[PDB]
Design a protein around this ligand. Structure first.
Ligand code: DHE
Ligand code: DHE
Ligand code: HEC
Ligand code: HEC
Lengths: 539, 539
């Protein structure tokens, strides 16, 4: 009764400014569920789960009710030239569906479930206790030259022996695994599906088998291991798309320890954003931290694991829409692309600061990038683009080449836009770039190769898809990846699940076809990650 | 169109797990706003703006629709003995309104507006530029012994002269100012209304005037100034109840610099909490930081301002429901209370960690606390409670008294529960305790005073309200505050806006009535803050 009067004063909030939602077109339970079913299959990626706008404009009731029914239907139908697909013209969605979507986006967005520690512990499993795991490598596999290839639509990954070109094992994982990452010791393989299911695989057991797993969210893209000296296999971190968050777990058993929300203020307008999806994550070699990229808010956070109980985080403003990126040759600056901002943020991991924001081309997509010493400009880091066919070379040596540091020092020209990965290797004198999503078939089925010993000359075209001899299908080639020796470059010919695919190997020394890996179990192969190169960031 | 096919794959989110909210009893616009008004007038204080629950159970659709109309009405009607007021039995609400509330709480919680930089800058006003301000004290007031009193309902504060006992200047401010804090230089007076409006007052002007103002949110409770060596008047920070956030501004002009969301995972369950209100904030004397309390998640954040461009926060976990608190005698340990957890957290600001979690009585409400040297136990910090009449004494000397460090070393007994503040001074041998919200009028209209040179002896009751000679009204006495030289203790006779109030002063040496401050302008006086004691944390 004392506690009653103590909190018995009015809230400073003005009810007239608290807004009730509604005034949308009446639509039944089924009309709504069908619209909801379509929204995540076709729209959520670009517009966001909450519809506050990611790559695309906000689709919340305030704005959609203002536009009204007809503007909405027409827009969804014909699309626009700035990224909005023509769902009606292309005949991808019927007029009836487009009508339901126009009505759906006029209601309050349905709420997706949260996902904290209770759900994480319930999903967590230790398949083989640490004490029951091999003390030595119980097999004759050349682990360093192994490849962890993603069999996207099969919810599996494949361990392919680099020298023999044969599949050594197919392991069940999360659906469409996005990337593979190696532990600092080179013993454990870490794969994470887009569904946020992480699988830890012991490469030492008789046969590479799974020793632990967990689900850190409803949707995810990144996973990483602690690499600072004295912290081998200590912690594993993973970033989720929804909910906006990242989790730190034990690097031996994947036991969840800390969960941190990334919901916050943007760097540009400094207003509140409800869905800042976590993207790339890279382990720092300069301090005991993980370097996390928060997309929609454009913040690079340095999560310090020196004391995992009292988490110290340093919020660095970069630029909106941070995505992928990698280390420069020295492994001190984090070159990451803020793709929809057309800039490349450089994060100094030693001095823990933003070194610069470099203007590049339309929608940079470096992947992890390509590092090499330019004969004139010195040490550079490069990236290709999705929005155009240009290739940016950036200065990454402040000590010996300060006049070029953090500048778009030169530009190269590929086959065209739709590019996703650019590759190279220390031992190699070639530079490869794919064009996976280029709207042309001939271009999307081939890669461009440049001569680093003569960058003035144009690129040669390698007909990767044609070399694979597969037959029908889009046969989109993607992500060049070298072997440990650096004399073989691998490519994935990403064909439909009901079609036939392959991994095409090329002799880097001669640019001649070396081999083609086919197998009924090689369903929709995407990411290939050579152990050594992924473990030691060789790119 | 490359970017279009690039984001064409489906979201990992399951359409079936995204839910539409509704099936709530129909209610017209008029009915919905009548209830929505009542909700923020009477319920949001304890249940929260989004109704996820604070001191009370969550009132969200998933739960309320399960209970149904009958349960809800019956509960709102009679309440519960565990803190939920009997809205119907008391005659406070009608059967018609109660029926409206039971319906309202079965609907989706309406959404309050956000409040970022655009809104803050829009409200930010610099009344007198730093260049046009005085260079020295232009008045002849004894500033250190001045008193900043809250004229709550009047939306103002009065500067009362400690020695003359007269009102020197009444200043217009935000509604129901909660607290007053002094800048490090003792020059500027910082005050903040519950509506989140902050006013900076220069005590050097011929007549104290406001030099800047800003609104940092929809509703708030705290403000603080940087007190680390070399950062006098450098930064001002404020915490907000809604939105869940805190803002850091320029300490000379109040220019908004950084805004940080406090929405996050909880310390106990580690699940997402959409509304973790910011409670107490105290400047660190050990490092250039602010120690912030995040109530619902039970997190103590150490925000370092050495570089406010790239903010560094250390998130220390304490216990659920952090509220108020204050420095131990040495100004190193932040003694804060997790009031609904019945504990007191000790945050070591030097080593930057949770020293301990001490169990206390029901609902500890220390205010800033009371520090004194116990004859047997050594240095102690005390607090009274709102749920019971006890006074817990906790040891605060881990260097010279390890036996009692962080232990509820002993208890004292006051008139009863409903206590809000306990007080003492280094030059004083008395310990005061108010009982502001105690349900018995006589008790709520007086204060208990113990003898620190004889703690075994029972307290003495001082008829503070009765001494004021005001007449009718509740006359709740509140917050014992000392003067510069610690020889008199002030009390606030907080009476209604239409009734008559006063400030009763006691001669600490004789426990006799010394003076009574009355003025037609002294409307609903609540908090009083002696400039010196507030600035130099003398408590
Ligand atoms: C955040 C992120 C990373 C960086 C993680 C890291 O390094 O820590 C990444 C890396 C990658 C890498 C890493 C390669 C590397 O060399 O580092 C691969 C193989 C890859 C295959 C694909 N990604 Fe990726 N990818 C996304 C997210 C990401 N992609 C998307 O959100 C997007 C645009 C939409 C989607 O549907 O996922 C997208 C499209 C694709 C594809 O279409 C690919 C080709 C196939 C697929 O399964 O989705 N992305
Ligand atoms: C977070 C918080 C602090 C700590 C501030 C700091 O140190 O930075 C505080 C301090 C305070 C202080 C500071 C005293 C001090 O010596 O530090 C005062 C005077 C005070 C007067 C009141 N407070 Fe307060 N108070 C709340 C919040 C807070 N009160 C509430 O949420 C609550 C429970 C309900 C409400 O309506 O605000 C509440 C009730 C009250 C009252 O009823 C008082 C007596 C009158 C009023 O205006 O609401 N609270
Ligand atoms: C990315 C590959 C997209 C997908 C998939 C979908 N949309 Fe989109 N949309 C996208 C962009 C970049 C834009 C802006 C384009 C421009 O010219 O400005 C849009 C815009 C919309 C809008 C219009 C918003 C407005 O002006 O108020 C609507 C109504 C919209 N998009 C709807 C929508 C739906 C329902 C989709 C799935 C069936 C969908 N979009 C997919 C990018 C992309
Ligand atoms: C604090 C001073 C409160 C105010 C003001 C209001 N409520 Fe409350 N309520 C409070 C507590 C501490 C509890 C817990 C009761 C217990 O015995 O544990 C409650 C609970 C409710 C409930 C019941 C919820 C449930 O059990 O499902 C309802 C329906 C409820 N309160 C409604 C409500 C309304 C509409 C109020 C304002 C008009 C209101 N509460 C004020 C604390 C406080």
């Amino acid at each position: 009764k004392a506690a009653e009067q103590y909190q018995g004063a009015a809230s400073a909030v003005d009810p007239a400014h608290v807004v009730r939602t509604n005034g949308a077109p009446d639509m039944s339970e089924s009309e709504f569920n069908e619209a909801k079913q379509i929204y995540f299959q076709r729209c959520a990626g670009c517009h966001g789960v909450l519809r506050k706008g990611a790559t695309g404009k906000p689709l919340t009731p305030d704005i959609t009710q203002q536009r009204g029914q007809q503007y909405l239907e027409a827009l969804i139908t014909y699309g626009t030239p700035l990224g909005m697909p023509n769902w009606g013209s292309s005949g991808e969605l019927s007029k009836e569906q487009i009508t339901l979507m126009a009505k759906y986006i006029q209601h309050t967005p349905p709420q997706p479930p949260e996902w904290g520690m209770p759900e994480m512990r319930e999903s967590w499993k230790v398949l083989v206790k640490p004490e029951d795991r091999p003390k030595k490598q119980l097999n004759d596999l050349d682990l360093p030259n192994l490849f962890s290839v993603t069999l996207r639509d099969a919810g599996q990954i494949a361990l392919v022996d680099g020298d023999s070109k044969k599949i050594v094992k197919v392991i069940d994982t999360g659906y469409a695994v996005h990337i593979s990452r190696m532990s600092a010791s080179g013993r454990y393989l870490l794969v994470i599906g887009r569904d946020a299911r992480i699988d830890m695989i012991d490469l030492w057991a008789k046969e590479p088998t799974k020793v632990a797993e967990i689900k850190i969210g409803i949707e995810a893209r990144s996973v990483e291991s602690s690499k600072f000296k004295g912290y081998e296999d200590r912690y594993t971190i993973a970033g989720a798309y929804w909910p906006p968050q990242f989790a730190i777990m034990d690097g031996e058993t994947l036991e969840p320890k800390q969960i941190v929300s990334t919901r916050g203020m943007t760097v540009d307008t400094q207003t509140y954003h409800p869905e800042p999806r976590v993207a790339a994550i890279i382990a720092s070699h300069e301090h005991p931290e993980f370097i996390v990229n928060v997309k929609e808010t454009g913040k690079v956070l340095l999560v310090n694991y020196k004391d995992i109980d009292n988490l110290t985080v340093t919020s660095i403003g970069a630029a909106p829409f941070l995505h992928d990126g990698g280390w420069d040759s020295s492994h001190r600056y984090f070159m990451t692309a803020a793709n929809n901002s057309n800039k490349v943020a450089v994060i100094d991991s030693k001095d823990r600061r933003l070194s610069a924001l470099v203007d590049v081309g339309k929608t940079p997509h470096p992947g992890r990038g390509a590092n090499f010493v330019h004969p004139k400009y010195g040490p550079v880091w490069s990236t290709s683009h999705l929005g155009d066919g240009s290739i940016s070379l950036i200065g990454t040596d402040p000590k010996n080449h300060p006049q070029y540091a953090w500048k778009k020092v030169a530009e190269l020209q590929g086959q065209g836009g739709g590019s996703l990965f650019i590759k190279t290797h220390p031992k190699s004198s070639h530079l490869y770039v794919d064009t996976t999503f280029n709207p042309d078939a001939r271009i999307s089925q081939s890669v461009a190769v440049f001569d680093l010993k003569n960058l003035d000359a144009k690129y040669q075209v390698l007909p990767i898809a044609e070399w694979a001899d597969l037959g029908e299908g889009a046969k989109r080639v993607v992500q060049p990846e070298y072997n440990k020796r650096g004399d073989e470059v691998w490519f994935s010919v990403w064909n439909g699940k009901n079609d036939s695919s392959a991994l095409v190997v090329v002799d880097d020394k001669t640019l001649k076809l070396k081999a083609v890996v086919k197998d009924p179990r090689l369903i929709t192969p995407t990411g290939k990650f050579n152990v050594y190169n992924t473990q030691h960031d060789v790119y």
